[PDB]
Amino acid sequence: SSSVPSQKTYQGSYGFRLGFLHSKSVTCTYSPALNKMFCQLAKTCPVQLWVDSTPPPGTRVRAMAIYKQSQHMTEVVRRCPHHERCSGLAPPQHLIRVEGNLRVEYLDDRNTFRHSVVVPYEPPEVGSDCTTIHYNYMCNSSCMGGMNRRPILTIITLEDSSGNLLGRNSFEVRVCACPGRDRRTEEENLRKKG
Amino acid sequence: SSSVPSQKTYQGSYGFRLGFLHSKSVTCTYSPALNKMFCQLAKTCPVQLWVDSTPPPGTRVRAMAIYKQSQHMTEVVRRCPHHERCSGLAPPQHLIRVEGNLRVEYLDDRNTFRHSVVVPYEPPEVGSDCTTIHYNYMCNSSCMGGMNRRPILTIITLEDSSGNLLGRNSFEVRVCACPGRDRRTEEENLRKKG
DNA sequence: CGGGCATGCCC
DNA sequence: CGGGCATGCCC
Ligand SMILES: *C[C@@H]1C(=O)C2CCN1CC2
Ligand SMILES: *C[C@@H]1C(=O)C2CCN1CC2
Ligand SMILES: *C[C@@H]1C(=O)C2CCN1CC2
Ligand SMILES: *C[C@@H]1C(=O)C2CCN1CC2
Ligand SMILES: *C[C@H]1C(=O)C2CCN1CC2
Ligand SMILES: *C[C@H]1C(=O)C2CCN1CC2
Ligand SMILES: [Zn+2]
Ligand SMILES: [Zn+2]
Numbered sequence A, B: 001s002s003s004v005p006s007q008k009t010y011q012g013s014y015g016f017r018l019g020f021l022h023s024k025s026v027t028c029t030y031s032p033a034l035n036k037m038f039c040q041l042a043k044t045c046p047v048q049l050w051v052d053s054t055p056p057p058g059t060r061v062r063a064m065a066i067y068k069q070s071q072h073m074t075e076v077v078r079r080c081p082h083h084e085r086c087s088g089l090a091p092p093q094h095l096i097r098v099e100g101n102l103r104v105e106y107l108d109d110r111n112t113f114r115h116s117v118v119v120p121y122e123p124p125e126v127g128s129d130c131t132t133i134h135y136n137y138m139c140n141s142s143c144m145g146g147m148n149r150r151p152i153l154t155i156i157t158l159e160d161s162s163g164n165l166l167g168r169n170s171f172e173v174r175v176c177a178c179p180g181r182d183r184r185t186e187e188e189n190l191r192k193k194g
Numbered sequence C, D: 001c002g003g004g005c006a007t008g009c010c011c
Helices: A081-085 A179-193 B081-085 B179-193
Strands: A017-019 A028-031 A036-039 A045-050 A060-067 A096-099 A105-108 A115-120 A131-137 A152-159 A165-175 B017-019 B028-031 B036-039 B045-050 B060-067 B096-099 B105-108 B115-120 B131-137 B152-159 B165-175
Touching: A017 A165, A028 A179, A036 A179, A045 A152, A060 A096, A060 A131, A081 B081, A096 A115, A165 A179, B017 B165, B028 B179, B036 B179, B045 B152, B060 B096, B060 B131, B096 B115, B165 B179
Parallel strands: A036 A165, B036 B165
Antiparallel strands: A017 A045, A028 A036, A045 A131, A060 A115, A060 A152, A096 A131, A105 A115, A152 A165, B017 B045, B028 B036, B045 B131, B060 B115, B060 B152, B096 B131, B105 B115, B152 B165
16 A cells, blocks of 8 residues: 555565675765765666575566655655756656666556666676676756755665565665765764764 | 847937845845846846836837856756746746736747747836836756856846837846855955956 | 865755 | 855866
């Protein structure tokens, strides 16, 4: 009955976890202490999928944004009117895109109105321990009429072809002009005032 | 042949001049030194019309915004996509509105695509030396996808019913959250660095 | 590139 | 209300 998707971590029977590459001026950088990705708008944000056990054929990987703060959780995260107007398969209203994938699907939920982007799950290549997806966030966190400075979480779910939830993980995202500066600022704030 | 309207002051045979009331946190304030109005979005910005001689019946008062800097003069000044979407008679794309007037006309030029807003000229009441029009600016100067931090001029023209230009005056506008702060900052910059 | 201005807003 | 943070950007 809820229109707010769960953000509860569920690593599940397949041992599903997210991973991030190690990285002022940088195009993205991930803070383990904050569980937070800092990245630039319309630029590659790699996310690694790690599993202990192999998902069944036909498993799908869904990404969805939700506002982090309780006061905004019920509002659908959308692209701002400016970036919606300056717009391949991604509807211009969608914040999150996937690049480099020929089987991407963009979904608008008939009941909750929430946007999500889905690609097939593929196991890592021989010798690799993870699968990397290239996400793109098409607005800054600050965009007026869109996220409007409100932090979001990205929720990544592993789902089988039948719709069973196999795993769920989430990370906070700040899309900003200066990821390196802002990560250092927030980590210092955590140490000094958190 | 030009699509850029003239901004040249032409006080003309009727002795046409603009006037402004004397005024942090203030909703508007005019700087004589800068010939610049500082005002808040969607709030009253009174402009006084002064003439030495009485215009003929059917005279009209037109207001139009142009970008002040040479690099942007040829671009039409428009409302940003966010404020256009969150919108009486004024088309949502128009930056400048007039409130309190039952004969307001909003014009989109067929050839130059520029927006303007027009009201009839009315002489001052007995004992008064000027006529006041209440303008509203529907975006901040900073609005992304609109003025985008670029200064504008407002051009006020007195035109007879036949289309003759009787007078022209202009003033710079900064639409901003804190007119009093920003006026003091710019006037200090003028004294120290201008 | 990094230093520092910008400017709506602080929940 | 004013002090000062915010955060894309400096032409
Ligand atoms: C955004 C990511 C990173 O974390 C670094 C810098 C750019 N990409 C790949 C490596
Ligand atoms: C998660 C794995 C690794 O450890 C490296 C970088 C990303 N994938 C493939 C090789
Ligand atoms: C915006 C104008 C002014 O200059 C002062 C303050 C509010 N209005 C009327 C007087
Ligand atoms: C321009 C005139 C004045 O001097 C005062 C204020 C505005 N109008 C009417 C009275
Ligand atoms: C973040 C900051 C930088 O380091 C360069 C890119 C964006 N911004 C301006 C220059
Ligand atoms: C300009 C500044 C003020 O003085 C109040 C109104 C807008 N802004 C925040 C509070
Ligand atoms: Zn945006
Ligand atoms: Zn606007």
